[PDB]
Amino acid sequence: KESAAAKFERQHMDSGNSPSSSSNYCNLMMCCRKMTQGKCKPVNTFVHESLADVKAVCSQKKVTCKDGQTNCYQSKSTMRITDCRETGSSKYPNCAYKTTQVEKHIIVACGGKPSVPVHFDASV
């Protein structure tokens, strides 16, 4: 199976099922992922929208990343990002996230050959 971009997709681009119990949804995702091991990731801005959209975005408007090496692209469109932030009475090991869904622009880091989405640079 593909890695890097599929790996990114799995880790971040969670175009999952209809939203319900958003806290639990996201807690479940990252708990299952286990990136909470030892230290709890402070925020994860899971893009809850179609991979085709994100790929299109990956070849929309390139912007100069805060690297001058990574080639990252803004989405002309806005899209539902799920900013899960460790706030829902977060107390290690009881890491519990406040699942903020919000619809705004994403900044995807494109890479590989062909140019595929490999990291989440930011959003605005």
Side-chain angles (χ1 to χ4, degrees):
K1 188 182 299 305
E2 170 171 290
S3 185
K7 224 289 299 308
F8 176 55
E9 198 185 80
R10 291 282 182 176
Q11 289 285 345
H12 193 83
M13 209 227 69
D14 178 36
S15 198
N17 192 12
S18 312
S20 181
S21 201
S22 50
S23 45
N24 175 255
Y25 202 127
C26 199
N27 294 345
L28 170 63
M29 261 60 186
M30 60 218 306
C31 177
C32 176
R33 214 89 294 285
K34 298 174 175 54
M35 279 56 268
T36 43
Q37 183 179 4
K39 18 70 187 68
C40 282
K41 302 295 99 180
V43 194
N44 189 8
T45 310
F46 292 92
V47 181
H48 280 54
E49 201 166 301
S50 319
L51 69 94
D53 211 285
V54 174
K55 258 289 298 193
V57 165
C58 217
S59 207
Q60 282 174 13
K61 189 62 53 171
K62 192 184 294 187
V63 294
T64 317
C65 313
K66 296 288 295 189
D67 293 287
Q69 189 179 23
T70 42
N71 278 237
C72 54
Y73 289 73
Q74 165 167 358
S75 61
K76 185 67 258 182
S77 38
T78 49
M79 45 210 303
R80 38 161 51 208
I81 46 171
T82 305
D83 190 281
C84 307
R85 180 175 176 178
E86 58 182 357
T87 299
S89 308
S90 20
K91 186 65 170 180
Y92 209 105
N94 316 269
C95 300
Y97 291 74
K98 194 270 270 66
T99 306
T100 306
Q101 102 77 5
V102 64
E103 290 158 55
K104 287 303 303 297
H105 317 92
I106 66 174
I107 317 297
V108 309
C110 225
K113 292 291 189 178
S115 18
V116 289
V118 2
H119 279 105
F120 177 82
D121 185 271
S123 44
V124 60

